[PDB]
Amino acid sequence: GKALVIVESPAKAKTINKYLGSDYVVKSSVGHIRDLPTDERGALVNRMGVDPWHNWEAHYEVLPGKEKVVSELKQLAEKADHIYLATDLDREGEAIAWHLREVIGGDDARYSRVVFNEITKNAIRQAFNKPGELNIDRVNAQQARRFMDRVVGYMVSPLLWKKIARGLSAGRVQSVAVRLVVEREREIKAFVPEEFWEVDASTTTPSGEALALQVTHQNDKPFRPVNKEQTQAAVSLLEKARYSVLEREDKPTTSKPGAPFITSTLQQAASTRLGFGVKKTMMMAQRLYEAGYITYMRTDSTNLSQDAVNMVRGYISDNFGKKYLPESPNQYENSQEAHEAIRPSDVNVMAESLKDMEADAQKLYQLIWRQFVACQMTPAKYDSTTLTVGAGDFRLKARGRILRFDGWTKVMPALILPAVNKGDALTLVELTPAQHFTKPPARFSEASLVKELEKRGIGRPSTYASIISTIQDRGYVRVENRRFYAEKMGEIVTDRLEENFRELMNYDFTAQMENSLDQVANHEAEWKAVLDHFFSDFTQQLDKAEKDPEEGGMRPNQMVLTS
Ligand SMILES: Cc1cn([C@H]2C[C@H](O)[C@@H](COP(=O)(O)O)O2)c(=O)[nH]c1=O
Ligand SMILES: Cc1cn([C@H]2C[C@H](O)[C@@H](COP(=O)(O)O)O2)c(=O)[nH]c1=O
Ligand SMILES: Cc1cn([C@H]2C[C@H](O)[C@@H](COP(=O)(O)O)O2)c(=O)[nH]c1=O
């Protein structure tokens, strides 16, 4: 007579309830109900909860206090015809659905796995309209990841306690992430600032208009004196030279809006524009999502549904007008790549209209809403001017720009050279030398590290945040003034791992393991075979590391005296 639906949080249960008829009964497991504990060694296998030596047999256990929840689901599941696992759409979500089906038990046919990337009326109806089945491959991909992380963490760390210090930790991806910071910390430590000069000139057009120029070439070669003498010498020539205009290339340019956000880009924009850290951004993104205000916050897809594009184009026509609406929609699909960007669930809901959301949560929505609306508006137009000037053997230039049509920038908050013809004489009024110095590489920010992680194909929309968090409370790196700093212990452990766990620390291999995980999720590889391969390369590394250093083993945090 009735159906039972299960979600992972009360917040998600409340929102989805508003869209499910009387035939359905929503219930939230209130978190993960079951999971792992909080050549061979029964002692090690028990602590890990997985057995690399008996074809990866696992020992999952119902989490503390959640035993009341199981019974809550159990008895509830019997007074129902069908059971719907409406956990989030990601692999982690697929595995949580699995654990739910396992615990409650029952014929596999009593279960369905619904997928949706936003909690709205029409998204909920279609999700339960054409329900799906649990996908064991995605579940196996998720456990594969969980098993190798456990292996690395529980088997490397003990070597580190013995070789380096007690309490240390090792992380499959985390240690690779720390490597990037350590390398960046070193580049900076060895950087040598270099001196170079620049010369500016103030002139007067024939009218009397002021014109500022920068010296670009001398003898047709790029101008860049490296000291104080060279500049004065150049300055001394520029003082007697006759200045004249020799081209006014007036060219029309445009700026295009960015694509709708994906996990990584949201984090960077939120951090750079709103000063939000990765943890903060993802926690608020989640609440907006579970509140039904935005699409799933874990994605690497910039695709937008026809419906979403139709609703926003409508908003653009009504609120901005025809000159802001492109002829055809901007397209940034099918079987693969069938997800969506982070966009509001209803373009007609303004940040100021969010009910149960805090100030910064509304601000994040605004940033998301603006990016979304802008991505579907026309480009902005400018008329760029470039004045090249000649003076003796020198060449100087001045650039200028005038806005002609705001286009997409209209939905963003509210925010020029004189007239001269080729051949006009400019009067020199003043010359101004300026000394500068090459700066060192920028320090990673929480988000810009994720950015670097993404381009190296190391992270994953659903792991970036955890990766940033997990490497901070361990003494390897620290964030000071919102920037990363490598700690001495971070370098100590990093050099050790690169020396005795090369494959594990290699970027390409780490990015490759993500591909391998995708092949599992796509039934192109079998999770256990993939795990056996990983363990094989791992233990060979580990066995070598545990040996005395005189036999090539890991270096202890030594430093001995004359004796
Ligand atoms: C939890 C998790 C999710 N995902 C995601 C992001 C997307 O929502 C989806 C990709 O779809 P797929 O698993 O069918 O290939 O799963 C990963 O790729 N790795 C993970 O570890
Ligand atoms: C040091 C610092 C930088 N920022 C910046 C400067 C950049 O605009 C942005 C991150 O820059 P990045 O992508 O080059 O790493 O955030 C802050 O917002 N707060 C800070 O405390
Ligand atoms: C993408 C984009 C965002 N912004 C933003 C994001 C911030 O929410 C906003 C500054 O905050 P404000 O609107 O509250 O004054 O500016 C731009 O100014 N230009 C852009 O091109």
Q: Which CATH-level-2 architecture of the largest domain?
A: Orthogonal Bundle
Number of helices: 18
What number of domains? 4
Which homologous superfamily in CATH is the superfamily of the largest domain? Topoisomerase I, domain 2
Biggest β-sheet, characterized?
6 strands, antiparallel, barrel
C-alpha geometry: flat
Oligomer class? monomer
Enzyme class: isomerase
Family: Belongs to the type IA topoisomerase family.
Catalytic activity: ATP-independent breakage of single-stranded DNA, followed by passage and rejoining
Protein name: DNA topoisomerase 1
Characterize this entry briefly.
By secondary structure, the protein is an alpha+beta fold. It contains 18 helices and 18 strands.
Explain what this protein looks like in three dimensions.
- This protein has helices spanning 10-17, 42-48, 67-78, 91-104, 121-129, 136-163, 174-190, 228-238, 263-274, 278-290, 306-319, 359-375, 446-455, 464-470, 488-500, 502-505, 507-521, 527-546, and strands at residues 3-7, 24-28, 34-35, 50-51, 57-58, 61-62, 82-85, 111-113, 195-204, 210-218, 221-222, 243-245, 250-255, 380-391, 394-405, 425-437, 477-480, 483-486.
- It is built from 18 helices and 18 strands.
- The strands form five sheets. A six-stranded antiparallel barrel has the order 9-10-15-14-12-16. Strands 2-1-7-8 form a four-stranded parallel sheet, sandwiched between helices.
- Helix content is 41%, strand content 18%.
- It has four domains: 1-140, Rossmann fold, CATH 3.40.50.140; 141-189 and 441-554, Topoisomerase I, domain 2 (Orthogonal Bundle); 190-256 and 379-440, Topoisomerase I, domain 3 (Distorted Sandwich), CATH 2.70.20.10; 257-378, Topoisomerase I, domain 4 (Orthogonal Bundle), CATH 1.10.290.
- It is α+β, with helices and mostly antiparallel strands.
- The structure holds thymidine-5'-phosphate (3 copies).
- The site of one thymidine-5'-phosphate has 9 residues, from helix 9.
- The site of one thymidine-5'-phosphate has 15 residues, from helix 4, helix 6 and helix 17.
- It is classed as isomerase.
- Keywords: DNA topoisomerase, relaxing enzyme, isomerase.
- The assembly is monomeric.
- Complex of E.coli DNA topoisomerase I with 5'-thymidine monophosphate.
- The protein is DNA topoisomerase I.
